[PDB]
Every structure is written in structure tokens, then in C-alpha cells.
Scaffold this active site. Structure first.
Site, mmCIF file in Angstrom:
data_model
loop_
_atom_site.group_PDB
_atom_site.id
_atom_site.type_symbol
_atom_site.label_atom_id
_atom_site.label_comp_id
_atom_site.label_asym_id
_atom_site.label_seq_id
_atom_site.Cartn_x
_atom_site.Cartn_y
_atom_site.Cartn_z
ATOM 1 N N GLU A 189 5.240 7.652 -2.271
ATOM 2 C CA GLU A 189 4.915 6.505 -1.394
ATOM 3 C C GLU A 189 3.785 6.740 -0.397
ATOM 4 O O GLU A 189 3.971 6.620 0.814
ATOM 5 C CB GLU A 189 6.161 5.844 -0.748
ATOM 6 C CG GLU A 189 7.257 5.486 -1.740
ATOM 7 C CD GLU A 189 7.681 4.040 -1.920
ATOM 8 O OE1 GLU A 189 6.826 3.129 -1.788
ATOM 9 O OE2 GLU A 189 8.851 3.832 -2.311
ATOM 10 N N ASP A 190 2.600 7.044 -0.933
ATOM 11 C CA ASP A 190 1.383 7.293 -0.172
ATOM 12 C C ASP A 190 1.393 8.560 0.698
ATOM 13 O O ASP A 190 0.573 8.660 1.618
ATOM 14 C CB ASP A 190 0.883 6.040 0.596
ATOM 15 C CG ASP A 190 0.409 4.859 -0.249
ATOM 16 O OD1 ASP A 190 0.495 4.942 -1.501
ATOM 17 O OD2 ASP A 190 -0.055 3.844 0.351
ATOM 18 N N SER A 191 2.269 9.551 0.401
ATOM 19 C CA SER A 191 2.174 10.826 1.111
ATOM 20 C C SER A 191 1.453 11.829 0.194
ATOM 21 O O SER A 191 1.232 11.521 -0.978
ATOM 22 C CB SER A 191 3.521 11.318 1.643
ATOM 23 O OG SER A 191 4.560 11.432 0.686
#
Ligand SMILES: [Mg+2]
Ligand SMILES: [Zn+2]
Ligand SMILES: [Zn+2]
Ligand SMILES: [Zn+2]
Ligand SMILES: [Zn+2]
Ligand SMILES: [Zn+2]
Lengths: 280, 183, 132, 106, 92, 189, 180, 49, 110, 46
Positions: free
Chosen positions: B52-54
């Protein structure tokens, strides 16, 4: 209503003057002093009043009096409401219009929308969120620094007495430690400075304001908050690094991602409040 | 950058020109003054710490200087004149005759009320000592932001358009890549 | 844009309304009455110096962009206009006749014609502690 | 440090400079050592003094590092020079009055 | 008619200094409606950030936010903010 | 404040602003819990808000040293305003208005300093010298344009701004011997 | 101190008790000047003792320039005698000395600004206006004009003794600020 | 931080009556006045001592 | 903390809105309020018996709050009144007043 | 042998104190930095 609201009471004859709390003053440096817009607006009402009183007392020139009356009318009126349709605003030297009473209550950020229906709070904390495949669904990774700041007031009881005494001994800097001791007497002991922070001997009923610890129930929230699921109760897990860690499957209800999102943490202060979180 | 006093300045330690470039960048001075570094990037599913966008960073590379940056904040303060008599002062306040002192420490101040450049500072510590005499005198000192720390880079003393003594203090830190750090 | 405003636009702003007159016509009773006058004030060419600074101790001197940013000054130059003051008079219909003034400080845009850094070479800027 | 580079920017580089660790096994970890901070039994002291005498740019190399501590005659702390011209790692560049005076504890 | 007493220098000097500083493009410390944000502090985060700030366009107040055909070659089709100012802040 | 438990004469106490507490540094007893930010509180009086959108901006700063305590707003044009009522309510302020008008002699000092290239600290000394000597019986009937011409050299002689008396003779006006005697009867006050 | 101030001028008033026609006095007295357009009195001088009298229509006069109390009374008597000799019922009445001025020379220089800074409440010194320092003594009430040269002017006295006492009082401070 | 309107709503949705009271009182604002029983006003001159 | 009061602790059950009778405004008031001056007993450092604490609320870390004492963190602050020279409209009710006149006789009040 | 301030250009140990204005010997350039502190500063090698 003959008791609480006769129509004769609509018109103003006497003016209730609010006390300083409603219109605070500040005394900076002997040549700088700040008064509240209301204190200004009042002084104009007064000045306009003192003027019209002298006119009526003296030789009343009829048309020079009604001229001074509709000035008084303006100052009193503009004090309760400065945003009046048709009328000129009362302005304050700098060109800005006087903050009338109406205008303090009115908007979002008013006294209603912004100091009563929602307000900022203590035992709150906020930081960047990041995911974790190793956290359990219901837990929340809490940075050590955040845990070391947020506190739970625990009552000294036979059950916890020894443990609590240890966190007190541990103090404000160590990780399972405490910040304050609240005596029956009401006065707060600051463990950071008290000369007796070492030799502190607890008594049943006192309160130890101890650090937030693994498995404490806490309210976790991602704003906006258009859901009951946008605020949920999690188990604390004190961890290193400056981010709030969350289980990935709990991402969806909050509507969070890790592109730079921050989240809010609220700490209950009562056994009752905690139950509410954990149980509902 | 080294000759200017601006509130906040962020400079990349080892900037790199991009391997993939635009013909238009020639005119944009981008290859001369870049905004990033060419990182060795794997698009992969690994420990699930990049969901999730990390993203995952090579902690080994971070040590070698990957993405480090300099950081300079500048604190200012005036010695204001309040009318015919009242004048603020640059000095090291003494806790007996000075009210509402900061809990922070004043020891790093030389008797001119400034820290000499080179001293390392830290949260709540007093960079600039000031008092606003009114009667003996209240404390009007400038402490370093509590959430920051570093070493004092440079400290300059000046007078302005009308000749009010005022002093600018630069503080340098090096920001190594950490966890919630955006890229 | 700025250059056009300094070289042309500025002059035309000084010349649109420009001249202002005040007329003092008497009561025509008898001396010292019966004296009608009209006074003029005119604005001619407009001048504009290189950027300068007026320190506390009177002295005025040039001011470079770096000194402005550090001492928190304004990088402005002087605006000067030629002023002329004529006088006229009549008795009880015939108008008969009986320098350069500072007006303000105008901030300069860097790299413009009026800025010091305009005709500056690469090595020049470096000595001036500016980035080329 | 009169250089165009930050104290810590330089400091960082000095760590990345490879040092002779042949006899590393006869040196103690300072943590395990019995002194107060460091000593000979646990560290190598390096010195670096550089100045822009030249009108031209004066370079600072890993060769410009000098051992000041007693080596106990063990193969340690020598800046590794693989460089053809025999300079090793380029630490810094100085102009004129640019001085760099520092001390390293390896 | 003393000249120095006649012309007030501070009128134009501080009158421009006010606008440029604060950003309320108008006269003066009694400003409204005046248009705030006309003058602003130059972005110095990165070199590109500085460049794109000196090519920024503001549009105050039919369908203005949309990218018009007439914007071809004159304004950047991509460089615009997300939210409130989207398509009202043009970049050359 | 002094700790009720300890009581040592130099009362060593700290203001732990960050936790919003006032502590006794010796015993650690908290002496106060309500604690307010004076910087941000002062931001509510002197702000950057000239438009009128800030709900925090709710007061204004004044100068009790120079203009005493004269709180007074001004009737002016707002968004929805008829140009008629502004005139009437302003023509009505005219009948309520001498010495509250001699404050325009500050506008004479301000326009003289700006014509003499003088700093903001000099004007405020010239305005305080003029307020404390313009109604004196010791000055009685001195040339009223030469007593404010003398209070500018009084304000310059404390703010360290070098201005000869012949430099102020060029401004206005000054009659030399007339503003030289006036520069002494005030100097005694 | 060893020095005695010298009386330089004594001003006295005298009521002649009888109205006067100034125009007539000016016409019959020698060395008289009358210009009512500037001063409503006849100015008359005599040589022994060298003095100048201001004669008014009211019959009152002021005698100036006398250097001793005796010369002042004596001169006053001569003026009255002239007014009579001209034809008026003038009489020598209410003689009274109103001011005595004296001067000194302490012989040494004086650092005036040091004396002014030291006795700020009594002295006003601003060479720009006047080169001498103005010392307003309290007891006796005498005004002194102190110069860099050591020259001293004492005035405001009604008795010659006040000049003497004023000088004795100031000598120590004059000496203290001597330039040496 | 701000426990705002939308957050009040979630608490109301949860049925966390006491958790809400705490946020709004103990955890922020909370104060004690003395009121009159006749005219329900904050008029009372409490010389509580 | 905030000190103990023997008064019974109760909860608010009803809120009874109404207008202020001038009689009541006068009756509540603890000060007359006569002067547009803040404090400054002419260039001083105390409140003027006229506007803010003529006989009113308390400020600046000082108890003096008319017998009540307590000071800041206990005192709610009590009201003063101002006696108006002539009646004026309350801006909010300029219309309800108008409507009431529109309903009743402007001579007999019927 | 000891110092205080510096010419931002002709870098020449200057030094001063109260009321001595804030200029330089010749070139006025009223800027003046403040030079380092004798006491050595220590750093992390990473
Ligand atoms: Mg996101
Ligand atoms: Zn060792
Ligand atoms: Zn009641
Ligand atoms: Zn009270
Ligand atoms: Zn009827
Ligand atoms: Zn120099």
C-alpha cells in the site's frame, strides 16, 4: 411569556456588560497592551452614550440629539452584529472589521461548531502511518516516544501497588515508567523534578499517571471519519521508529495507505472508558 | 547555499544527474542542479513491508550516504526599543533577577547572549538570550525547537535600516533516511 | 515586463494627471484686493538611480543583493522627478509670469536593466556571492 | 574547517575510508576494553591537517591521514591505497585560506 | 512653499513596500477588497521549484478549470494543483 | 509563587511549558496546571489578518504610553454598504468631537521625520516629548511650530541619531534663539 | 579665597512723588533723550557719579550704572534735583537698591563641562547659546556666569554682602574644576 | 489534537456515551460553576472557603 | 486542581431561553461602568473603577475579585451593566419588534 | 591569537563591542560573520 419573555424586553434599555473572561486583555511590555475588540466596541457605546446623555440634559436641539441617538444605536447594534446588511461595518484602525459577538458564535470555527461540538483534546497523538505484516489485526504499533508521553491514571490498589511502585521508580525517561503521582490531597507530584521521585511511597487510592503500555485499549482514527469504522479500538504495542504501524487488512475501514497518511490516537483515562473501547 | 541566511534550507549530500533525461532539461539546468539520485530499484514482493504505497530501503546503502541530506534552520531575534526608556537586551539571563525562565539550559551562551558556532545543541536549549526589562526583567530568549537538534553552523550580528541590533543563528543537522520518510 | 515599466510606463504615469494648479482670485474691493493669481506645479523627466541604501548615520551608498538579503533591507533605487513652479497674475484676464526632487524608493527586480547583476559575467557573480 | 563542506559531511566520508585491518584480531573492541573511552589496546588515532597554499585547488586524500597512536607493531590503521598515482580516497578540495584540521579515532 | 514639506517621500516608498511585502495589492494598511497573494515568497526548495514559481499564473473567481484547446503551446497541460485551485493556477 | 512544602528563600521554580505545568524544582510539586501560550495569545491581538477571515484574530494592540487609553473604532464601508449611512454616522461623529484633535500634531512630527529621513524610534520619542510639554505653563506661549521643532532634537538626542540644530533649522523653521530657549525649558522637564 | 568681587553695577528705584511731563523734561534737561514711540520714559545721564536714569511720567525713576551704594543714592539725588530745577514738585522718596552686579577673576582656567555635569541641578551650560556657564545658587540667591577664563559674574543681589557670600561659596567648586 | 464533529458522530454511532463525555470534559474543556435554583443563572457568589 | 465547594453537584435537565428584563440586568450587575477607560488610573498599572473591573471580574494572576476572590482559575467572572441614554433596538429583534407593532395598536396597545 | 568577527569579504579578524558601530577598516561592508569557537566539536563517524 409573562415571566421569561415580555415583548417590552426586546428593546435595549440596560446593557449587560460581559466580564474580562469574555473579552480578555493582555499586558505585553508597558508600551504594548492588547484589548479585545469588544472592549473597543463597548468604549464606543459608552462614549456615544455619555455624549447623548449630555445633549438631553442640556438644551435639547431635537435634530442634534436624534443624530447622536442613531449613532448610539449603531454602536450597540454593531457590537452584537457587525455583518449587518445595508449598514456600514465598524472597523478597527487596521482596516479589519470588529469581531462582533454574533461572529464569534457563527461559523465552523465558531464557539458552537468549533469549541463545543468539536474541540482539540489532551491524551491525543498523531504521526505517519505505515503497514506491518507482523502485527495482529487488532493491534497498533506505537512509537516509544509517543508511549513515553501519553499517560493512563491508574489507582493504587493492592493488586497493582508493587508494579506501579516500580514504574514510579523507573520514572519518566525509561520505557515502562511513569510521569506523575496524584496524592489524595489533590496535589500532583512531578516525577521529573520532585526531590522525592526516588523515595516515593505510594498509598491505596493515589493515582500513578503511568506510560501507555502493550495491550492498553486506544482509539485509533483516520480523518475524515465518515464511518463508525473510521475510529476503532486497538491493543497498544510499543515499538521503535517514529510511525504508527497498522495491520494491512484494517487499512480499508480507515481508508488509509502509506503514501504519507497520518493517523490520530486517543487514550481513555477511566476503567469505564477503556471498557467502552474494548467492549464496543 | 553556504552564503545565505534563509529560514530552512534542504541540500542533498550526493546529488546525481538522471540516467534517463529529457532534451528540454538542458535549458532547465537540471543535470547541473539535480533533485534526486539514481537508485537500484527492484519491483518485487518481499517481506510485505512495501504494501500500500510503502517501500523497503537498503539500510546498508543508507549508511553509505544514500539519500542523506543537510538541514539548515535559521533563528532570528531583534533587540527592540520600546519608547523612551524600555530596551530589550542581549545577555545571559540570571535566574534570580529574571522571571519566567525557560526550563532549558542557558550554559551554552557566551556573555554576549549567543552560542558560539561549533557548539552542539539539542531540544529546548537556549540559542539566543534576551530580556525585556520592565520594572527585575522578564525572559525573552529564543530556544531551539524542541523536536529538533544539531550543531550551530554560523551566527551573525547586525543592525538594520534604522539601526536595531539583530542577530541571525544558523543550525545544521544531517537528516539520515528513517521510516516514515517520503520518496 | 519590469523593464518596459521602468523605461516607459513610469514616465507616462508621471505625465497623465501630472501638473496641478491653484488659483487665488481676489475680492476686487481695493488694494490690497483686486489681485487675481494662478500658480503652477509641473512634472518633467523622471530619473531612477541604481539601487542604494540610507544608513542610520546619514551616509548613502550602493547596495548589492546579498547585503539586502542578510541585513533584511529592500533592494530599491531612488525615484527623482524634475519639478517646476510657475506663478501668474491678473488685475480685477492676462496671465503674466512673476529642480530635481526625490519622491520615493522603488524596489528593483533582480537581473533587470537597473539591477547591478544585469551586465554581470560569471566570475563577476561569484565574487558578489551570488549564484550564476 | 574553512571548507565548502559540512563538518559531519566530511566526518561521514572518513568512516567510509578503508583502513588496514590485517591484525584487527589483536585489537580490542573499546566496549570490551577497560579504559575511559579509547586507548592503544582498542583504537588507532589518525590526524589530518590540510591547507590551500596553492593558487590552484588543493586536494585532500586518504594518504594525507597520519597515525598518531602507538601501533604495538601490528598491521592496522593504514589508509588502504589501491590508487595507481598513490593517493587513495579524495576526501576534500580546498582553495586558498581553506584549512581542515581534525582528529580521527578508528 | 518649502519643497521637502510638500512632497512626502514615504507615500510612494512605503506604499510599494507594503504591497510587495504583505501581498494585498492595494492602498494600504486599510486593504480589502485588495487581492492577497499577488506578491509572495519565492520557493527555494529545489532549483526546479524556483523556476516553476516564476512561471505561475493566478486566475481569481464559464468552465475555467478545464484544459482549453487555446492553452496549446501557451500553458502546461499537466502542471496544475489538485483541489480547490485545480485548473485556476496555470503554468507557462 | 513559592512551594508550600519547601520554602527556600530563593524559590527555585521551573516553567515546564511543554507539559503546561509550573513545577517546584526542588520537591517536584506542581504549583500550577493551567498555563497559556503568550506568543500565540499575542498573535490574536497583533496578527497579519487585515482581510478579516481569521476567527483567532479577535482583538487589537494599542499604545498606552503615547495615546493613553483611547479605544475607538471607525465607521467605514463594508461589503453590503450604502454610501448614505456612512456619511450620516460620520457626520454624527463630528458633533461629538479640541485636544483630541491636537493629536494631529503627531502627524506633523511624523511628516517631519520622514522629510528629515529619521528612524521609527525617533518619532516615538518626539511624540512623547511633545505630549509631555505642549500643555506646560513652563513653556507658556512659545512659538508652537518651534516647540515641536525642539522636541525632535530631544528625541534624536536619546536615540543616538546625529542631527545638528541647523539641520532642523532647514526643516522647520526655526527662529534660532526662539527654538533654542524652548529646547531648554523642556530639557528641564 | 583671598579675592573680593568688584561691584560693577547697581540698579535703584526712586519715587519722586509727583506726575511728570516727559516732553518738558526732555526739553529742559541736557543729555536727555525721549522717544515715546519706543519707550515711555526719558533717558538721562550724568557724569558724577557716572550713571543713567530712566524717568517716567508717573514721577518714578530707575538709576543704573552706579558702582557703590553711596554713588547710587547720590546720583539719584542729582536727578531729582534736576527735575525740580526744571519746575516739578519732585522729592527724593522711597530710595531702594534693586540689583547689584559684581565680577571676579580667580586667575585660573575652568573646565566648565565638568562643573556643569557635577552640579547639574544648578548649572546650565551650552556654549552653543552662550559661552559662559549659568550657575543658579540657592543660598544666597545669586546667579553666577562662570567662564573658561576664570572670570566670574555675580548678579541678583540686593545687599553687596550676597555677592561676597556667593563668591566664597563657589570658590571651592571653581578650584575643584581648575584646568591644571 | 481536534476531537471534532465527525469524531463525535462516530462515538455517538458506537454508543460510547461515557468515552465521549470524557473526551469533551475530562480530556479538555471541563469546568465547575455554581448556579441559582430560582433563576437558573451563573449569578452565584460562591465564596467556597 | 480546582477547590471544593459544599454546593450540591447536579446535572442540567432543562434550558429555559428568554430575553433579559432591564430590571434583571440591573439586578445581576456588580458594577456601573461609567468610563470608556480600560485601566490606567492615568498612566498607572491598575484597573479603573469604570470599565473592566470597575467592581468586576479578575485578571493578571491576582485574586482581587470583590470578596469572591478565588482568581482566574475559579472565578467565572461577573457582569456589569451600562445605563443607556435612550432606548435602542436589539439588532436581532428589529424585525420581531416591527411585527409586534404591525399586530398591535400604536396608541392603546391592543 | 584570539578574535571575534570577520569581513565577509576581506576576511580580517576584526572584533569590537558596544557602540563601536559595526563597520570595517576601509571597506565598510557592514556584514561581519563571527568565526568558530576554540573548544573542539566532536562528531559521529557515520
Ligand atoms: Mg494516501
Ligand atoms: Zn582501550
Ligand atoms: Zn438567582
Ligand atoms: Zn468573582
Ligand atoms: Zn387603539
Ligand atoms: Zn571589511
Amino acid at each position: 411569556n409573562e415571566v421569561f419573555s415580555r415583548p417590552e424586553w426586546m428593546i435595549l434599555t440596560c446593557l449587560p456588560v460581559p466580564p474580562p473572561p469574555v473579552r480578555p486583555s493582555i499586558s505585553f511590555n508597558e508600551s504594548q497592551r492588547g484589548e479585545d475588540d469588544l472592549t473597543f466596541k463597548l468604549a464606543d457605546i459608552l462614549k456615544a452614550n455619555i455624549s447623548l446623555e449630555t445633549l438631553e440634559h442640556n438644551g435639547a436641539p431635537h435634530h442634534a440629539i436624534e443624530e447622536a441617538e442613531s449613532l448610539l444605536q449603531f454602536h450597540v447594534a454593531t457590537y452584537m452584529d457587525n455583518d449587518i446588511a445595508g449598514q456600514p461595518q465598524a472597523l478597527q484602525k487596521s482596516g479589519r472589521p470588529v469581531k462582533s459577538i454574533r461572529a464569534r458564535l457563527k461559523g465552523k470555527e465558531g464557539r458552537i461548531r468549533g469549541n463545543l461540538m468539536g474541540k482539540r483534546v489532551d491524551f491525543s497523538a498523531r504521526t505517519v502511518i505505515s503497514g506491518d505484516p507482523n502485527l495482529e489485526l487488532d493491534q497498533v504499533g506505537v512509537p516509544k516516544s509517543i508511549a513515553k508521553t501519553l499517560t493512563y491514571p491508574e489507582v493504587v490498589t493492592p493488586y497493582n501497588i508493587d508494579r506501579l511502585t516500580q514504574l514510579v521508580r523507573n520514572g519518566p525517561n525509561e520505557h515502562p515508567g511513569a510521569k506523575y503521582v496524584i496524592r489524595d490531597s489533590g496535589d500532583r507530584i512531578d516525577l521529573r523534578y520532585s526531590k522525592r521521585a526516588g523515595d516515593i511511597q505510594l498509598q491505596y487510592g493515589w493515582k500513578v499517571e503511568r506510560h501507555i503500555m502493550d495491550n492498553d485499549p486506544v482509539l485509533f482514527n483516520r480523518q475524515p471519519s465518515l464511518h463508525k469504522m473510521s475510529m476503532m479500538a486497538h491493543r497498544v504495542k510499543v515499538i521503535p521508529y517514529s510511525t504508527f504501524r497498522l495491520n494491512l487488512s484494517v487499512t480499508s475501514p480507515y481508508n488509509a495507505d502509506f503514501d504519507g497518511d497520518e493517523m490520530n490516537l486517543h487514550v481513555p483515562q477511566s476503567e469505564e472508558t477503556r471498557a467502552e473501547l474494548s467492549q464496543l | 547555499y553556504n552564503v545565505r541566511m534563509d529560514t530552512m534550507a534542504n541540500i542533498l549530500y550526493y546529488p546525481q544527474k538522471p540516467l534517463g533525461t529529457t532534451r528540454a532539461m538542458e535549458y532547465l539546468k537540471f543535470r547541473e542542479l539535480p533533485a534526486g539520485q539514481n537508485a537500484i530499484v527492484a519491483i518485487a514482493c518481499y517481506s510485505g513491508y512495501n504494501q500500500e504505497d510503502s517501500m523497503i530501503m537498503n539500510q546498508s546503502s543508507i549508511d553509505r550516504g544514500l539519500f542523506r541530506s543537510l538541514f539548515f534552520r535559521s533563528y532570528m531575534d531583534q533587540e527592540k526599543k520600546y519608547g523612551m526608556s524600555i530596551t530589550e537586551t542581549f545577555e545571559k539571563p540570571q535566574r534570580t533577577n529574571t522571571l519566567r525562565m525557560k526550563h532549558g539550559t542557558y550554559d551554552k551562551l557566551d556573555d554576549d547572549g549567543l552560542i558560539a558556532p561549533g557548539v552542539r545543541v539539542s531540544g529546548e536549549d537556549v540559542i539566543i538570550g534576551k530580556t525585556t526589562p520592565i520594572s527585575s526583567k522578564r525572559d525573552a530568549s529564543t530556544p531551539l525547537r524542541s523536536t529538533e537538534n544539531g550543531i550551530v553552523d554560523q551566527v551573525l550580528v547586525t543592525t538594520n535600516q534604522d539601526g536595531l541590533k539583530f542577530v541571525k543563528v544558523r543550525v545544521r543537522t544531517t537528516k539520515i533516511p528513517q521510516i516514515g520518510d517520503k520518496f | 515586463s519590469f523593464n518596459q515599466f521602468v523605461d516607459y510606463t513610469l514616465q507616462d504615469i508621471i505625465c497623465e494627471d501630472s501638473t496641478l494648479i491653484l488659483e487665488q482670485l481676489a475680492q476686487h474691493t481695493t488694494e490690497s484686493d483686486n489681485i487675481s493669481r494662478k500658480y503652477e506645479i509641473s512634472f518633467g523627466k523622471i530619473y531612477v538611480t541604481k539601487p542604494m541604501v540610507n544608513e542610520s548615520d546619514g551616509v548613502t551608498h550602493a547596495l548589492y543583493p546579498q547585503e539586502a538579503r542578510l541585513r533584511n533591507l529592500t533592494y530599491s533605487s531612488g525615484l527623482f522627478v524634475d519639478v517646476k513652479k510657475r506663478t501668474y497674475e491678473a488685475i480685477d484676464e492676462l496671465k503674466y509670469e512673476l529642480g530635481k526632487v526625490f519622491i520615493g524608493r522603488l524596489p528593483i527586480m533582480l537581473r533587470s536593466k537597473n539591477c547591478y547583476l544585469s551586465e554581470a559575467t560569471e566570475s563577476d557573480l561569484y565574487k558578489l556571492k551570488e549564484c550564476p | 574547517n574553512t571548507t565548502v563542506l559540512a563538518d559531519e559531511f566530511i566526518a561521514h566520508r572518513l568512516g567510509l575510508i578503508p583502513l588496514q585491518s590485517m591484525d584487527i584480531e589483536q585489537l580490542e573492541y573499546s566496549r570490551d576494553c577497560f579504559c575511559e573511552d579509547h586507548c592503544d589496546k582498542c583504537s588507532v588515532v589518525l590526524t589530518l591537517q590540510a591547507f590551500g597554499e596553492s593558487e590552484s585547488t588543493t586536494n585532500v586524500y586518504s594518504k594525507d591521514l597520519v597515525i598518531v597512536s602507538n601501533l604495538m607493531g601490528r598491521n592496522i590503521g593504514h589508509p588502504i591505497i589501491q590508487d595507481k598515482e598513490g593517493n587513495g580516497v579524495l576526501i576534500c578540495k580546498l582553495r586558498k585560506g581553506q584549512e581542515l584540521k581534525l582528529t580521527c579515532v578508528a | 512653499f518649502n519643497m521637502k514639506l510638500a512632497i512626502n517621500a514615504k507615500t510612494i516608498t512605503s506604499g510599494l513596500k507594503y504591497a510587495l511585502a504583505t501581498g494585498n495589492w492595494g492602498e494600504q494598511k486599510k486593504a480589502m477588497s485588495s487581492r492577497a497573494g499577488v506578491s509572495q515568497v519565492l520557493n527555494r526548495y529545489t532549483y526546479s521549484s524556483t523556476l516553476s514559481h516564476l512561471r505561475r499564473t493566478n486566475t481569481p473567481i464559464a468552465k475555467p478549470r478545464q484544459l482549453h484547446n487555446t492553452h496549446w503551446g501557451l500553458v502546461c497541460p499537466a502542471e496544475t494543483p489538485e483541489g480547490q485551485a485545480c485548473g485556476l493556477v496555470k503554468n507557462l | 509563587l513559592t512551594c508550600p512544602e519547601c520554602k527556600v528563600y530563593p524559590p527555585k521554580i521551573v516553567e515546564r511549558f511543554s507539559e503546561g505545568d509550573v513545577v517546584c524544582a526542588l520537591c517536584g510539586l506542581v504549583l500550577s496546571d493551567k498555563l497559556v501560550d503568550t506568543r500565540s495569545e499575542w498573535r490574536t491581538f497583533s496578527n497579519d489578518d487585515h482581510n478579516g477571515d481569521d476567527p483567532s484574530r479577535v482583538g487589537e494592540a494599542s499604545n498606552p504610553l503615547l495615546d493613553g487609553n483611547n479605544l475607538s473604532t471607525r465607521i467605514g464601508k463594508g461589503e453590503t454598504t450604502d454610501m448614505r449611512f456612512t456619511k450620516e454616522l460620520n457626520k454624527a461623529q463630528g458633533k461629538n468631537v479640541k485636544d483630541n484633535e491636537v493629536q494631529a500634531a503627531f502627524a506633523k512630527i511624523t511628516m517631519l521625520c520622514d522629510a528629515a529621513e529619521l528612524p521609527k524610534i525617533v518619532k516615538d520619542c518626539a511624540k512623547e516629548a511633545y505630549k509631555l510639554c505642549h500643555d506646560e505653563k513652563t513653556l507658556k506661549g512659545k512659538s508652537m511650530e518651534s516647540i515641536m521643532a525642539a522636541s525632535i532634537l530631544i528625541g534624536c538626542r536619546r536615540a543616538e541619531v546625529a542631527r545638528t540644530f541647523k539641520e532642523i533649522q532647514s526643516l522647520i523653521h526655526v527662529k534660532t534663539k526662539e527654538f533654542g530657549k524652548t529646547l531648554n525649558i523642556m530639557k528641564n522637564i | 579665597s583671598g579675592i573680593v568681587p568688584t561691584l560693577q553695577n547697581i540698579v535703584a528705584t526712586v519715587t519722586l512723588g509727583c506726575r511728570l511731563d516727559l516732553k518738558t523734561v526732555a526739553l529742559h534737561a541736557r543729555n536727555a533723550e525721549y522717544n515715546p514711540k519706543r519707550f515711555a520714559a526719558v533717558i538721562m545721564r550724568i557724569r558724577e557719579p557716572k550713571t543713567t536714569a530712566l524717568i517716567f511720567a508717573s514721577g518714578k525713576m530707575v538709576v543704573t550704572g552706579a558702582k557703590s551704594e553711596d554713588d547710587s543714592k547720590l546720583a539719584s539725588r542729582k536727578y531729582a534735583r534736576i527735575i525740580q530745577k526744571i519746575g516739578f514738585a519732585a522729592k527724593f522718596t522711597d530710595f531702594k537698591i534693586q540689583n547689584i552686579v559684581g565680577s571676579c577673576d580667580v586667575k585660573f582656567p575652568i573646565r566648565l563641562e565638568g562643573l556643569a555635569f557635577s552640579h547639574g541641578t544648578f548649572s546650565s551650560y551650552e556654549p552653543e547659546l552662550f559661552p559662559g556657564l549659568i550657575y543658579r545658587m540657592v543660598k544666597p540667591k545669586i546667579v553666577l556666569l562662570i567662564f573658561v577664563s576664570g572670570k566670574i559674574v555675580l548678579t541678583g543681589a540686593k545687599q553687596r554682602e550676597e555677592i561676597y557670600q556667593a563668591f566664597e561659596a563657589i570658590y571651592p567648586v571653581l578650584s575643584e574644576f581648575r584646568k591644571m | 489534537l481536534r476531537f471534532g464533529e465527525m469524531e463525535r458522530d462516530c462515538m455517538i454511532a458506537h454508543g460510547a456515551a461515557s468515552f465521549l463525555k470524557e473526551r469533551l470534559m475530562e480530556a479538555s474543556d471541563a469546568f465547575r460553576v455554581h448556579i441559582c435554583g430560582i433563576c437558573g443563572l451563573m449569578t452565584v457568589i460562591a465564596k467556597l472557603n | 486542581g480546582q477547590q471544593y465547594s459544599s454546593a450540591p453537584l447536579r446535572t442540567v435537565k432543562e434550558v429555559q431561553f428568554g430575553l433579559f428584563s432591564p430590571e434583571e440586568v440591573r439586578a445581576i450587575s456588580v458594577a456601573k461602568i461609567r468610563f470608556p477607560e480600560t485601566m490606567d488610573e492615568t498612566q498607572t498599572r491598575a484597573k479603573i473603577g469604570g470599565l473592566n473591573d470597575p467592581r468586576l471580574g479578575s485578571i493578571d494572576r491576582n485574586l482581587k475579585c470583590q470578596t469572591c476572590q478565588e482568581g482566574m482559575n475559579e472565578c467565572p467572572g461577573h457582569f456589569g451593566h451600562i445605563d443607556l441614554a435612550k432606548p435602542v433596538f436589539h439588532v436581532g429583534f428589529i424585525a420581531k419588534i416591527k411585527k409586534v407593532c404591525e399586530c398591535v395598536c400604536m396608541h392603546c396597545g391592543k | 591569537a584570539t578574535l571575534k568577527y570577520i569581513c565577509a569579504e576581506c576576511s580580517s579578524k576584526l572584533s569590537l563591542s558596544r557602540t563601536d558601530a559595526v563597520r570595517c577598516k576601509d571597506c565598510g561592508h557592514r556584514i561581519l560573520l563571527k568565526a568558530r569557537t576554540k573548544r573542539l566539536v566532536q562528531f559521529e563517524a557515520r
